[PDB]
């Protein structure tokens, strides 16, 4: 049911660096995940122009943010193109290798963590706040999968037994104890306004 994999070394290093660097401007993680969601929504929207049956797994194109204080989780849901098994195990990490490498050179040369997105690797900024990240994702061409990592050099992928999601990606951030401010309605709004106000899809905050 469950396979465990090692991160590429460079990504495993970016991850320790993100978990072990004192860096207080942690809010930018939301911006980056909303930005990944937006690119995924662009992609399915574009593909649907030539093949409208790609939207048979769901027409609405949106981002839901879903704080949950009792679980200490923040879930970002998009109805973008989703990820295949190859994407999760291989292809995205292969792509992220070069940008991770540049990003770390850039940090050594004075850049700061907030520029992570310009290297295509903003996803791993989740680890500024999350001790564990679960990604549930469904691409039209594939089954539903659950990726998960608490960093420390590995991640698992398994096919996902739970509720079907149709098409898309759900990123479930298990927050560090000291990061629970990112579960507050006001704080999330503030972040979204400040950082994500030009995203061309509806972002809905789910209030508890
Ligand atoms: O396809 N779904 C993706 C994705 C995959 C490849 C490039 N950009 C976004 C995705 C990845 C991370 C994330 O937080 C949300 C997403 O929808």
C-alpha–C-alpha distance, residues 203 and 197, integer Å: 9
Closest CA to 134 of 67, 176, 57, 74: 74
Mutational test site, ligand 1, from 80, 134, 141, max ligand atoms within 8 Å of CB: 80
Closest CA to 200 of 42, 65, 36, 83: 42
Burial 21-38 (b: 16+ CB within 10 A, else e): eeeeebbbbbbbbbbbbb
Q: Which residues pair with 78 in a beta bridge?
A: 63, 169
Domains of the chain and any CATH numbers: 1-208 (3.30.565.10)
Q: Whose CA is nearest to atom 14 of ligand 1?
A: 33
Ligand-binding annotation for 97, yes or no, is yes
HSE at residue 79, side-chain half, CA atoms within 13 A, is 19
C-alpha–C-alpha distance, residues 99 and 32, integer Å: 15
Atom of ligand 1 lying closest to residue 32 CA? 14
Non-local CB neighbours of 200 within 8 Å, separated by 6+ positions: 38
Q: What is the resolution of this structure in A?
A: 2.1
Pocket around ligand 1 at a 6 A CB cut-off: 33, 36-37, 39-40, 78, 80-83, 92, 123, 169, 171
Experimental method, per PDB record: X-ray
C-alpha–C-alpha distance, residues 27 and 79, integer Å: 23
Q: Whose CA is nearest to atom 16 of ligand 1?
A: 37
The CA–CA distances, whole Å, from 203 to 20, 22, 108 equal 31, 30, 35
Burial class (CB in 10 A: 0-12, 13-18, 19+), 121: buried
Distance of CA 66 to the CA centre of its chain: 14
For every residue of 132-178, which 3-state class applies, written as one string?
EEEEEEECCCCCEEEEEECCCCEEEEEECCCCCCCCEEEEEEEECHH
Sign of CA dihedral 140, 141, 143, 149: negative
Find tokens 């093949």 and name the residue. Answer: 51
């Amino acid at each position: 049911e469950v396979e465990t994999f090692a991160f590429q070394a460079e990504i495993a290093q970016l991850m320790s660096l993100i978990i072990n660097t004192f860096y207080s401007n942690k809010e930018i993680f939301l911006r980056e995940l909303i930005s990944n969601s937006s690119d995924a929504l662009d992609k399915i929207r574009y593909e649907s122009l030539t093949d409208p049956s790609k939207l048979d797994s769901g027409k609405e194109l949106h981002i839901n943010l879903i704080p949950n204080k009792q679980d200490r989780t923040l879930t970002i849901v998009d109805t973008g193109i989703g990820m295949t098994k190859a994407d999760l195990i291989n292809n995205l990490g292969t792509i992220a290798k070069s940008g991770t490498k540049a990003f770390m050179e850039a940090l050594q040369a004075g850049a700061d963590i907030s520029m992570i997105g310009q290297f295509g690797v903003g996803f791993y900024s989740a680890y500024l706040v999350a001790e564990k990240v679960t990604v549930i994702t469904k691409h039209n061409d594939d089954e539903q999968y659950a990726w998960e990592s608490s960093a420390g050099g590995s991640f698992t992928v398994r096919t996902d037994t739970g509720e079907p999601m149709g098409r898309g990606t759900k990123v479930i951030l298990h927050l560090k104890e000291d990061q629970t401010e990112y579960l507050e309605e006001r704080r999330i709004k503030e972040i979204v306004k400040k950082h994500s106000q030009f995203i061309g899809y509806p972002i809905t905050l789910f209030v508890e």
